[PDB]
Structure formats: structure tokens, C-alpha cells
């Protein structure tokens, strides 16, 4: 129902348009990116190595972008201010290019008629929601907000239901993640973070994540009591979380099995997943869930002290939320 | 000095080899490897892909194995009680085989007059020694025991400081670990354990360790104060333990910084060290350190609850431990 | 229609088991591998680190694999001549074990009353078939046949359009093969052929292949006059044969491109592909075609002198080939 | 220590050149200038190489300057090629390793800054391109802006004229089979104008094009027209292998070819052309010198008139070495 635009066709903007097409959620009627021209946008949707050639139609037709036969507007702008996503019929616009994260710099596509504007991305100072965790606390009133991180959108589910059930008095998160755009093929230039310049095929490489921090403003009860780190591995898609936390009330792993797969069974569903399978990291590629707890893989050392482990699609769990967001919205419209 | 015997010229047995030639610490005067003929040892000796090619000779001369001018005697045996170490020369032996752990099977050794057997591994019941944590406990009426695990020889140096300096309440370790020989290329059998089959290149595999749980054997003070897990991640080498501990008394990072260089630059000097330096794993290959602590990496909640980070060259600071741990034995006779 | 057994459960095992489901060409009955027990091989059917989740259903019931609700009989010897294929009705068996590829064990299978033997890898001594190219000289007398190597299949296939058309007076072919299960993860012992132990991960690896010259068997007319190598690459799947021959008439690259295409819409359409797409390794994951010419990567010195590029998903064309060769045996009797 | 160098791109082949100098001593690097990599930035990327190791050396920023084995080097950070002072920090020959100034127009802006001539790391459309051990000696003190060709001319180059000047090579395909370089990317992105190079480097085999075979008949004239080939770019992070398929005019036992390759790499391309019959793999070359290894056991004749003949390159550290053995030749002359 509610029609969109997509600025950025990068690995989230065309897996959000594939979302899109997929679920049948949203409509997708627009679209920018300057590094990207019609026929190359053609064979970046179609083809793709972690999750393969779209299963549907795509061509350029009239210099419109036509998936599924649905006709698609496509700008080549630098600016976004400069984007008339009014025109082309975009109420809400998802801004995937991960350099305007801000209200101010996400807001300049208002300029262009966009009614709303989804940051696909952390924001400095948007409100920040995760669907299953903060999304009932959108309201109207909200035009510039943020879907957080694909890490947040692991880690909140979780941590929700173990607060909601024993009280996390404190936790540290570890996320092996797996390579993203942002790295290199080889040793090479990273001015402000030179650890994430290092070969990616060659390294394990720790970085700083904001996502545990981030789960305190989504949870506000957890504001302060969670921190965390991240590896960089070199595996292409799907990545782990690892939450080292100390639980206030008494809490057997069988306990914590127990709620878990009942919040996945009802108010979390297709949100937070529950396996007791021998799944590895390709068992989750294109996997729609935000995180799928391993009950196999966590340990405990007593009833206050676990370690608990979530398996997420950092690629296509997150779009889908971005449009599960956006229905969301449009539901409250 | 003493004269040792290698059963298994493995990633192991083999790097084992070539720290005794380069630390001149023992003297390798037998092989033994039913799978690996004298021709074919000194190819598989020579040319190391994680390692290098060795510098020095190594050639068959005579039915022998030739290191550095030194001859080698090379047995063929799958059964160990067949192998004729005394007629070789080796009072030691080097258990690197992997299915030889436990006392009674090591112990075969003993039939073919080896005076001592070290045990490449953890084992089930012979007594565990990591170098400078308890290495002082052994005594001359041991004739089996245990080097423990290349993950308990990274954990157990930095759990004997911060436990020595703040004391351990519980402790959760991950190891983030590189490929070994036991995992599989594709997805193939391995009926025990179902993830361990699973594609060594495409996955992080979540696996078992004791290492944790070890560290309270070599720890007595830690007896159930630890355990954890690992991951395997498409790396061929090096490794990197996150061990998220709860401290008795509080502490500062900027403490926990300051009594782990101290104990690198004393009496840990060459078994743990220290780097404020923005590394990544490949900066660890070939690294004789049983333990590197990773400053930058590391992150505290608040003065009880942090996350401490260590490298280790999985192959490399195992093997130099094994000859340093013989040398040690050799002292003491 | 007709009634197959599988003996070896592996990746061509189990993909020609995918393969039957899915296309429906042929009935697997009975399976037999003493390493996967009916719950594994739920498991290993289930979950491919490769492929994706199998699409339908699996479950072990009253001691069979049921899959899409045909149940299948499960066997568990070491010892082919001891499988009752005849009592779980099998009337072919697919020999996917690679240790029973000579006619002598390959024929233990008729002792327990399968009717023919199809040899999944090429044989020394077992007639050869690909699809496309020699299977209409299979006749009723052979019960014990091969259907080749996967390499064969891409090469055979690409030969016979381009002899047919221009005849080739010689030609030199590499495949740059994704690793297989004989790999190794790390450094270590590969009998007479060294180069195959060295880690898979770390290295591009030389290695024999008798695929070219096996062209020469399945296309009599080019006995002799084709051979060529491998190099094995750290990818988990796909590979590309690049075949360089002297014609004996003239051939403008348009016209090769002319007669291949003409080929694929044609007598070997599901088995010789063509593109002009912008396509690299990953875009045949799960492509089911024996041998996809790639228009765009190949390069002409002159119009007798050329290098043409053909992509083979070497597990999945091939499983999808032994389905095919059974259901053709099948039609002549 | 003759003449003195600058470094235009701090990058793969700017560092491991400076690698190359300081252990042969053949040249002295006395600047630098990357826009990107600033002071103490650089002494992190030349100290620590994921591929080729820590540096067996000393390293450090003192007083603005990248300090190795107690060599003081002048940085600096300018975006525009025509910019940079090298006269004044005394660089004669200027190495052009960023990959974006290879035309003479482009790379003969290090002559406004005083610099006496310019190495291209790289091919050129017009530059000169030379190939030490196979036409180097062709190299004259006219030439300020010359290009010392590929890493895979380098490879393909001195077996070429080895085959050719014993057999004869009426007509030759080549493949090479290339590790990653900084080119690629880690996932599947934007590359416009060559839309395969985008797709995920560690994920793939990626078909490229090359001109490198084109230019064996540049630095060999008698093979101009008779070579072409291609490149699959696999996910190893360095060394590559080259695959020349070559018809002969002369009949060749592979006995033979092998007797004149090893001859060859024991006489006149000692340590260019390598000759091994090891059974090696691709890592047994990380930080071999030698242009070209030809390994005799991967080869194979069909018949004594065509041939597959393998030879292996450290595609960074050969290279590298070249780079500095060319400017010590080029000094040589002046
Ligand atoms: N990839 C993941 O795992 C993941 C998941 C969660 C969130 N994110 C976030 O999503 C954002 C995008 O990440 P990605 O992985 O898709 O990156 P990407 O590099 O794959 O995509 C970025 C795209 O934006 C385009 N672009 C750049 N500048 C532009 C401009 N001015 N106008 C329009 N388009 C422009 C680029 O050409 C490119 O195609 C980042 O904020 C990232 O942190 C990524
Ligand atoms: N690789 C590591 O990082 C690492 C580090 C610490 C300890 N370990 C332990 O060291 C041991 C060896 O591991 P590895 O990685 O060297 O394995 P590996 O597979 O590389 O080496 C094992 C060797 O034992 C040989 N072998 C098998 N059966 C034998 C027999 N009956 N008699 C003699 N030799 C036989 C094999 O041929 C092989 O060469 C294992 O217990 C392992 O857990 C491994
Ligand atoms: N994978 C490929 O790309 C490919 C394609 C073409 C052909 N082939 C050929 O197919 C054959 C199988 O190769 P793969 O890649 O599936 O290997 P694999 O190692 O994945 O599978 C082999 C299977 O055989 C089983 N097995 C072993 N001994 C057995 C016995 N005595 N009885 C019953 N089962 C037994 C193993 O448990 C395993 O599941 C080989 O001959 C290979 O050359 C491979
Ligand atoms: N890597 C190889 O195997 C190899 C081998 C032979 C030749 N080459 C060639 O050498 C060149 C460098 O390749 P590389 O692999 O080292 O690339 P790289 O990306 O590692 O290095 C290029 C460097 O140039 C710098 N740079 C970019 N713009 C600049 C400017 N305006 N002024 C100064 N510095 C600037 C970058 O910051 C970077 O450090 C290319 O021409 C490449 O084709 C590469
Ligand atoms: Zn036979
Ligand atoms: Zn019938």
C-alpha cells in the first residue's frame, strides 16, 4: 500500500526493493543513486552472490527500473534536496546510503515532498525503534526516524526477553560479524579506523560497535548496563551475537529455553527465532528474522551467569524490518 | 640436551620440529607418522603455507631425516606400542597425534622405553601444565602429562594475572578460532559432532572447548569459576580468546593495562604479552607468545565486568610451549 | 518411474538424491552410507552450507528417511556385495562413493540384486557417458556404466558444437575447479599426490585431471588430440573449464557465439547454457546445466585460435546429469 | 645506495618498493607522498603487511619524517602530482604507484617538482614499457617517463622469450589465474565501467581482461601479434600463476623445454626467470623475488608443437623488486 523511495542502491537499498517485491509490504516507485545507471542498476538486483538472482522479472523499460512489471522512477542525484521524490509518489523515503544518519542531512528529502524518512542506520539523535522491541511507541508525530543497526535488531529481541523474565543486572556483548562493504580486499587506507583497513579475506580484525548501547535506548531499563565489541571474519554474510550477561532472578538454561521459544511462538514471531538444531553461520543466509537464538550453543556456568547466542542475517533480516517498519507506519497513518 | 621423539609430524609435531632446530632447547632424534614417509616428510618439513619455508637444511639421506646436518631416525608404526624410541635415542616423547590422549594411551610409549610422554593436547586424566601458570607443580615421578590445550595456554597466563591482582568471581570465554585439521572443506561426516562436518570455508561453526574449565585445573583457585566456548571462522591461523570476567575487588582498565605489561616485561616475559597497537590477526602469524593482550580491544562495562581480549598463534606458541615445557622437564631430572 | 538406490550419501550422493526429488525424473528407494545413521542423514539432507535448505521435507520415520513423504529404506554396510537393493526394490544403484569406480566392485551391487550400476566419477575400466553428447551408444547390454567427471560434462558438451562445426585439430584445456572433500582445511598428508594435502583455503593447487583426455573416449573423433590440468582455488563451488584449440576452418568469434547459442536452444538445451551476461562464479550456484558458455570472457587470436570459458556448478550440473543418464537408461527398457 | 627515490602512492606496490629498497640497498627512498596515509599513519601500514609480515627493521615518525633503519624520509601530502617538492627532498627518480597517473602527460607532472625522471608501476598507453631481463637494455638516458609494465608482463615476458628464442612461438593464449587486489571489493558494490570487478572478491572467480600478453609483443617485437589471453581473479590475497598455451615451430620435448628453462634460470635471468620441479602451490611463492617460476611438473605437452607451461608470481613482491632493480639499471646508464 504506501509507496516508496530508496535512496542509495546499495546492499541494504536493493535488499529492502527485494523485501519489498518479496513480501509485497510496500510499493517501491522510486529510486537514486549517482555511482549507478539504469542497466547497472538492472544487473546489481538481478544478480547476487550471497543470495542469489531475484526470483521475479527485472528490466529497464522507457528509463524506468521494472521489477515484477511495476514501473520504478530513478534519479541520478548527488543531493538529496535536490530528489523530487514528491513527483514520482514517494510518502516515505529509506535513506540506505549511510551518510546522511543525521535529522538535519536525513531530513533534506522532506525538501523533495517525502512525507517520512526511514534512516537505515544508527542516528546521532533520530528516535531509534526495533519492530518486536520500541516499534508501538512510533506515533504520527514522527517524520525523520531510524531502524537502528542489523546488530541492535539482534541483540534487543533477546535481551527484551531475558530482562523482561530474570533482570539483566549487567552484560557484554560480542558480535563475530561477517564482512561488509566498508573493508578491503587488501591492506589499504582507513584513516580514522585503521584496524578496518586490514585485508578482510586475510584477518580476524576487532571494531567498535554502538549496538549494546543502542539496546538502552530501545529498552530504557538497560540504559547503561550493556556494552560490547565486534570481530570482523572473513565470511560474506551472517554474523552472531554473544551476550555474556548476570541475570537478577534464578535462571536454568532450560528456563531460559523455555521463554525464548514461547516468545517466538507468539508476540515475537518471524522477529526472534528459536533452534535447538546443529545450525552453522550459512543455515541463517536469507533468513528473514532479526535473531535466531541457538539454544544448543549458549552455556551457562550458574543460574545467574549464561552466555547466550542469536544468529542473524545482517543483510536481509534488517531489510525486512525496514519494510515491516514501514508497514508498520502506514498501518497507523 | 634431552633427546625426544616426535609421534605425529602434524601441523604440531612439525612446528614442534622446527622450534627444537631453531631454539636449539631439545634434540629431535625420532618421528614416527605411519601416513607421511621420509620422502614425503621432507617436503611436508620444508614447504609450510601458514609458516613458511624452513630456513636451514632438511634432506633423507640414508633412510634418515636430515635437519640442520642432524639425522633423524623415521618409524611408520600405527601402533604406538611398536615404536622403537629407545633403540632411537628418545627419552622423550611427543604425543601429537590427536587419538593418543588419554594416560593409558600415551602410556604405550613407555613399551617402546621412552622415559616421558607430553601430550599435545588436554587429556582426560594425565596431569595439565601450562608454562609459567603452574609449570613449577611438575616433578620427576610424572612420567605422562598433559601441555593442555593451545586456547588453555592463551587464557590460563592472563586468568593467573588479573585472578593474582583483582581475583575472579566467574568468568565466560569465546575463542574466535582459525580452521584445524580436524574440521572438513565441504559439508562431510562427522557423526559427533554434526556442526564440526560442516563446511570449513563458508562457516562460523560453534564449538565445544574445555579450555575454560581447564584453566581451573591449572588455576586451582578458578575450579569452577570458568567456562566458555569457541567459534571456528575461515581462518587458516591464529586465534583470539574474549574472556568476559566478573572481579572481586575493582579495577580500572587503565590498571588491568598496567599489571599485564608489567607481568609481560617479568615474569611472564615471552609466554604473555602486551600491544596498546591497532593489530589484527595475521599481525600474530608466527608469534611464539602463548598470550598477547589486546589493550585497544578490551572494553569495561564499570570496575567489576570487562572484556579482556588475547591472541595467540594457535600453531606456533603451542609448539614453542611443548620444547620450553621439555626443556623444563630436562632441568629437573 | 524407475526405482534407484544410493550407495554413498556425500555431496553427489545427496544432490543426486535433490535432484531426483525436485525434478521427479527418477524414485530413490533406498539409501547406503555406514558413516551418516538415518538421524544424520536427516541433518545432512536438510542443511547444505552450498545450496540452501532443502525446499520440501525430511524426517526419519519407522526407521526410514522420509522425504516428501516417499520413504526411503536406509542401509548401513561397508561391504556393497551385502546391500539388499533387491528387497528395498532398487533397480539402479548410483555408485557415489568414489572408492568402488572399477566394474569388479562397482558389480558387488548385482550380488544383492540391483539390475545396473551407474559409477558417479569416471571409471578405469566402465564404459563413459555424458549427457548430450555419447548417451544414445549406452544400449541394454551394459549394466555397469559412468557417467564421467563433472569436468567432462562442461568440457564434452562445448567440444562436440565446436568439432562439429569447425573440427578441432588440437586443444589444451585448464578448470579452475572450486575444492572438493579431498581437500584438506590445513597442511597435511595426501598419499601420492602432494600438491592435494596443502591447505585449501591458503592456495591455488595444481592438479592432474584426466577430463580432457576422457573427451577423446565419449567423442572418438578427438582421441588424442585434447588434454589439459586443474588448478583447485579457494571457492566452495563452481568452477570453469577454459579450453584453447586450433580449428581447422575458419571461425570469427561471432560465429562460435552463433553456434553455440543455436546449440543451447537446441539438442543440448538443459545441458550446454549460453550467455553474454556480465556473469562471475557465484551466478551458477545451483545452476543445473552441464556447461554454460560464456560469450563475454573468451578471447580470439585469430579465427583458427581461440580460448573459450564455460561455467560448471560442479556438484548440482553433475547430480542433475546422473538423474538425467538413469532416466534415459530407463527409456530403453 | 646510488639514486635517490620518491614514492607517488603509499599503497601494495609503494610500500613493498620501499620493502625492496631497504633490504637490496640497490637505491635509496629519501620521500614519500600519499594524501591519504599521513605520517604516523604510515609507520603503522610499512610496520605491519598482512601478507608479507612484520618488517624485519626499525620504524618510527621523528621530527615529520617516516624514519626506517635510521633513515629519514621526507613526507608529503598532495593530491596533485605536479605539486610535490621533490627536488628539495632530493628524489632524482620518482616511482608512480597510485594508479591513476600512467599517460606520460599525466605521470610527467613529477618533473614540474623537480624530480629527473618517473617509473610507472604500471602499463601505459604511451610510456615506454620495460621488462628487466628481456628488454631493459634497450632503456636510454632520453627516456624520463617509462613504465616497467605488469606484474603478469613480468611473468609471461622472460618465459616468452626463453620458449621463443629456443623453439620459436608461432602463436600463444595465455590465462592467469590472479589474486585479489585493491581493486576489488569485499561484497558485491559499484565498479561502472567493468561491472564483474564489483561483484564480491572473496565469493567469486571473476573473468577480467588483460593487455599483458598483447604487451610481451612490445617488449619482445618478434612476438607482437602473436599472443593474447585473459585473467580469473580467484580469492587468495597475493600470488598468481600464468598458463601459456603456445604452438612451436620447432619440435619441443617437454624434456627439453625443462633443460632450457633451468638453463636460462641458472645463467642470463638468474633471479628473473625461477625453474623449479618441487611440488609447490601457490603459497610457496609468498615473497619470492623472481619475476617467473616455471613449474616443470604442472606443465603439459600434447604433442611436441603445443604446450601448457605454468609459471608462478609473487604478483606484489617480484614486482616490487623489479621496480627497484630497473631504477639501479637506469642510473647505471646515466
Ligand atoms: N550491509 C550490512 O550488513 C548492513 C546492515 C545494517 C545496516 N547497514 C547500513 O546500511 C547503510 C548502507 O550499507 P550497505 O552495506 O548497503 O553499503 P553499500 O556500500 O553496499 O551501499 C551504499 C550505496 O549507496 C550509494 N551511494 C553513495 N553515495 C550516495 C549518494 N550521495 N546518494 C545516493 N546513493 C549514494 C553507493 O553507490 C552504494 O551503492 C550503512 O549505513 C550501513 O551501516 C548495513
Ligand atoms: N593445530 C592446532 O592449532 C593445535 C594446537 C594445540 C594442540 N593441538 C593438538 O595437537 C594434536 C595434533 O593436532 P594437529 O593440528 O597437528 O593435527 P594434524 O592432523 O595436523 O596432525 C596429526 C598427525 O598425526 C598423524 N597420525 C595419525 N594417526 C597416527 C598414528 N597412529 N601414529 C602416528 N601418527 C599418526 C597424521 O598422519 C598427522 O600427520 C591434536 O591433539 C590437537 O588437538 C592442535
Ligand atoms: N563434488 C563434485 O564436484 C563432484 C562432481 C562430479 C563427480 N564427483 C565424484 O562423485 C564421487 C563422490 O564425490 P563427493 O564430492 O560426493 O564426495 P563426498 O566425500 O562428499 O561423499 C562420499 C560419501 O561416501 C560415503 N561412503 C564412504 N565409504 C562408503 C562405503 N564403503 N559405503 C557407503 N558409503 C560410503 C561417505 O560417508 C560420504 O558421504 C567421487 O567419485 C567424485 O570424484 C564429484
Ligand atoms: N598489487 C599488485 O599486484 C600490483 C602489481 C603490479 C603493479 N601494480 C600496479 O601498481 C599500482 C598500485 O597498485 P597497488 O596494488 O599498490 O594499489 P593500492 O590501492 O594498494 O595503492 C595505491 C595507493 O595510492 C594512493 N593514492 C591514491 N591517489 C593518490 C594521489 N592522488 N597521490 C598519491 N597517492 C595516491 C592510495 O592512497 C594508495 O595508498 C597500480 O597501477 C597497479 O595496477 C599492482
Ligand atoms: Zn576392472
Ligand atoms: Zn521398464
Not at 8 to 16: D, E, N, Q, S, Y
Not at 111 to 132: L, N, T, W
Not at 141 to 170: Q, R, W, Y
Amino acid at each position: 500500500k504506501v509507496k516508496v523511495g530508496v535512496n542509495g542502491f546499495g546492499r541494504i537499498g536493493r535488499l529492502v526493493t527485494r523485501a519489498a517485491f518479496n513480501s509485497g509490504k510496500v510499493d517501491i516507485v522510486a529510486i537514486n543513486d549517482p555511482f549507478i545507471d539504469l542497466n547497472y542498476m538492472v544487473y546489481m538486483f538481478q544478480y547476487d552472490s550471497t543470495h542469489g538472482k531475484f526470483h521475479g522479472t527485472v528490466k529497464a523499460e522507457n528509463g524506468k527500473l521494472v521489477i515484477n512489471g511495476n514501473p520504478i522512477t530513478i534519479f541520478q542525484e548527488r543531493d538529496p534536496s535536490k530528489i523530487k521524490w514528491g513527483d514520482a509518489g514517494a510518502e516515505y523515503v529509506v535513506e540506505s546510503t549511510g551518510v546522511f544518519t543525521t535529522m538535519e542531512k536525513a531530513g533534506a528529502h522532506l525538501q523533495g515532498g517525502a512525507k517520512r524518512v526511514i534512516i537505515s542506520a544508527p542516528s546521532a539523535d533520530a528516535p531509534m525503534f526495533v519492530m518486536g522491541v520500541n516499534h508501538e511507541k512510533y506515533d504520527n508525530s514522527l517524520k525523520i526516524i531510524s531502524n537502528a543497526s542489523c546488530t541492535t535488531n539482534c541483540l534487543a529481541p533477546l535481551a527484551k526477553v531475558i530482562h523482561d523474565n530474570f533482570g539483566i543486572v549487567e552484560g557484554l556483548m560480542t558480535t563475530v560479524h561477517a564482512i561488509t562493504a566498508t573493508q578491503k580486499t587488501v591492506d589499504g587506507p582507513s584513516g580514522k579506523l585503521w584496524r578496518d583497513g586490514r585485508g578482510a579475506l586475510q584477518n580476524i580484525i576487532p571494531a567498535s560497535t554502538g549496538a549494546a548501547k543502542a539496546v538502552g535506548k530501545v529498552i530504557p531499563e538497560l540504559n547503561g548496563k550493556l556494552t560490547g565489541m565486534a570481530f570482523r571474519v572473513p565470511t560474506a554474510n551472517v554474523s552472531v551475537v554473544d551476550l555474556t550477561c548476570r541475570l537478577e532472578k534464578p535462571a536454568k538454561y532450560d528456563d531460559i529455553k523455555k521463554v525464548v521459544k514461547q516468545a517466538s511462538e507468539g508476540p515475537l514471531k518471524g522477529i526472534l527465532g528459536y533452534t535447538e538444531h546443529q545450525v552453522v553461520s550459512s543455515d541463517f543466509n536469507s533468513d528473514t528474522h532479526s535473531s535466531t537464538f541457538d539454544a544448543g550453543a549458549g552455556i551457562a556456568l550458574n543460574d545467574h551467569f549464561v552466555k547466550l547466542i542469536s544468529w542473524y542475517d545482517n543483510e536481509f533480516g534488517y531489510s525486512n524490518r525496514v519494510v515491516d517498519l514501514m508497514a508498520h507506519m502506514a498501518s497507523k497513518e
